[PDB]
Design a protein around this ligand. Sequence first.
Ligand code: HEM
Ligand code: OLA
Ligand code: CL
Length: 420
Amino acid sequence: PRVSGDRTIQFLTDGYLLPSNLRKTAGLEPESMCPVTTKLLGQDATIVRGSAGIDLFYDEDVMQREGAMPPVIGDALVGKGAVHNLDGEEHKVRKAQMAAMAYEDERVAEFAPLVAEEVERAVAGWEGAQGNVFEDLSLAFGRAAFRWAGIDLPAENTDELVGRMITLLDNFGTATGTPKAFWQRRQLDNWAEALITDVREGRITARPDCVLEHMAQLTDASGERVDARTAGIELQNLTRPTVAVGFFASFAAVALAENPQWRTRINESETGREAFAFAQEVRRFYPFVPMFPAKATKDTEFEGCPIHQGQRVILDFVGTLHSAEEWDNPASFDPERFMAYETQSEAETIKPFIPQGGADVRTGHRCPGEKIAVTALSAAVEALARPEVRISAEAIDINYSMTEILARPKSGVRVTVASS
Ligand code: HEM
Ligand SMILES: CCCCCCCC/C=C\CCCCCCCC(=O)O
Ligand SMILES: [Cl-]
């Protein structure tokens, strides 16, 4: 199945609708698991979804990531030289050091009380006042992430830096926004490089064993220190994605407005199980990652479709999370799907549940921050569910576009907390 011509421009016009539009234009039936091939950025790109597509995408014998993400997105979103761009043993060494920070249960346990405290502070700010879920909980997540990582700055400086991260996250995916995103990336990289250099030179003392110390000690496969700007880029890759949970928190507020019986169950629970299941089904249901790219390292073949060395293979995330072959009633928002699961580690066993990537965290490129992200999102769900939180139901607060990346309600979701 092929779609003719170069469809690069259609990525910007279609956003999250791009993969299902191309499968339709190719003549596939709805719910087909067949790959579809088009041209993007002057080369072939084959779009795959579902369990077999996951197995292909994460097969590092045939897939590489260097050069897969277009720089206009990647250099703004994750920065130059980031772990996302690495392959092979160098990738494994860098990823081990980053997963040691984000993915270890004891470090997650350190994050949990910090994010609960910052969420509670944001929500207290809504009392008798006009709050904004996206802006205020993204800020709360960023404050928690800096405290968690051992980045110790005056409150005004932290808020300003977290604000730059929000501006970057809110703008990197559009034609109008990309100059703003690249401006913020420049300032943040200068800031993080200066901080790493200050730690390495002894001008700033980092808490022993904190994330900041470990990023200052970041080394490559030969044992040599990574340069200071790259280390600062990796420090941002362990703090900015926590800020980005604000997108899921905005959707969670929408979902709580739309699912008042689940909201009641969360408020009446003693266990946190409903809030966890609700947070997971927010990550399954709402659009965040549209798709993600890799490049073939050698000629190969996938379900009768030839895959040429150097072409892109694009895993369609929305189409996997919403595949009727992989899920029962995928268009239904239903936290019961996850009520039998107790931890994020257990949720990893669900093969098509890939909101932050698939396969294995330490041996592949899968996100190492899902435990942090579910911790932050669950804290948000529990605080947003409380009955004194009044979530706006106006159209600009509830609806979101599928044709712009990233997606969120235009207003950010307006909220207030009832007060006496
Ligand atoms: C809104 C929340 C988040 C989303 C939607 C998200 C999504 C993703 C996705 C799609 C990938 C690429 C997976 C692949 O290449 O196959 C990824 C990788 C990564 N994420 Fe997350 N993430 C989030 C939160 C976090 C958090 C909280 C952290 C750390 C504290 C984090 C750190 C990373 C890192 C370091 C990588 C690169 C891993 C590698 O290439 O080996 N992310 N994330
Ligand atoms: C031709 C290449 C086609 C592939 C284009 C892929 C577009 C990907 C768009 C957005 C990726 C979102 C990644 C998740 C961001 C949140 C975590 C973070 O801050 O790093
Ligand atoms: Cl299911």
